[PDB]
């Protein structure tokens, strides 16, 4: 996250950290939608062009954290992965379309002041909030420059008109994604913040909703491009099948 700021403790309790067991490194971001299910971008678990194909054992998730490095004692909860689920029509060859996937935690996690699930949008909220000019929020432990972040970083980004997205990009942005970012303030999702949640606070009920997923944060601020985010609503359908079929 570039040009962002340090988050306040408990500011984003649905924030999750995808962690590689060995090597011991930070993979991606993720979000708690339930006490048993974690959401994230697909290109975090699978991406042949780089030889990424994690099994449900190559990693584990850390919930409730603030600090990137330290093991926050009595705060963060270590959670294992039962079964990963990548979306079938996930094209990486083409444009990271349908860049999304679910992970079921081995055991239910207990919610605390620093661990609470986020809300998945519905057509109503989705249709009234997703609008050009309308801001959302991005969090993650991604790079600071274009630098490592001591703690979770946070940045609010304005959505951009679909006409100004497809244009500035020589990529094929599908219906299952949208782009956000200021036009040439700077600040955006940098690599590593991927899988993180893109959220908005509904004025109809005061609850935070995850409108999208971080799939291609606009480089790292440099004027010209906008980050590509998964359209969580346009894919909520798949999400439920997976959770429903359990």
């Amino acid at each position: 996250i570039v040009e962002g700021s340090d988050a306040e403790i408990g500011m984003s309790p649905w924030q999750v950290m995808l962690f590689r067991k060995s090597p011991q490194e930070l993979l991606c971001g993720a979000s708690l939608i339930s006490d048993r299910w974690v959401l994230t971008a697909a290109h975090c678990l699978l991406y042949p062009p780089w030889d990424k194909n994690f099994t449900e054992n190559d990693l584990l998730v850390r919930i409730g954290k603030h600090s990137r490095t330290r093991y926050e004692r009595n705060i963060e909860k270590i959670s294992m992965l039962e079964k990963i689920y990548i979306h079938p029509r996930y094209n990486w060859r083409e444009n990271l379309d349908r860049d999304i996937a679910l992970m079921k935690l081995k055991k239910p996690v207990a919610f605390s002041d620093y661990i609470h699930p986020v809300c998945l949008p519905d057509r109503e909220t989705a249709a009234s909030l997703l609008q050009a000019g309308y801001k959302g929020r991005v969090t993650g432990w991604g790079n600071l420059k274009e630098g490592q972040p001591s703690v979770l970083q946070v940045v609010n980004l304005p959505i951009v008109e679909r006409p100004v997205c497809k244009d500035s990009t020589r990529i094929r942005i599908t219906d299952n994604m949208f782009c956000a970012g200021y036009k040439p303030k700077r600040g955006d999702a940098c690599e590593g913040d991927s899988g993180g949640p893109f959220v908005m606070k509904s004025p109809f009920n005061n609850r935070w909703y995850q409108m999208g997923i971080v799939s291609a944060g606009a480089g790292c601020d440099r004027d010209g491009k906008y980050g590509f985010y998964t359209h969580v609503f346009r894919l909520k359908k798949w999400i439920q099948k997976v959770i429903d079929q359990f």
């Binding site: 700021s5 306040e8 403790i9 408990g10 500011m11 309790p13 939608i33 605390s112 002041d113 620093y114 609470h116 699930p117 986020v118 809300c119 909030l129 000019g133 309308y134 801001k135 959302g136 929020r137 946070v154 609010n156 304005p158 908005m200 606070k201 509904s202 004025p203 009920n205 005061n206 609850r207 935070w208 909703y209």
Partner: peptide
């Protein structure tokens, strides 16, 4: 699903340092 409400903020009638900034973008 009591989701979407933050224990240390909503649940205590407290706002975070920059959430108003989002509302404003909504209310134009």
């Amino acid at each position: 699903a009591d989701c979407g409400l933050r224990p240390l903020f909503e649940k205590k009638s407290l706002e975070d340092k920059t959430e108003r900034e989002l509302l404003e973008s909504y209310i134009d």
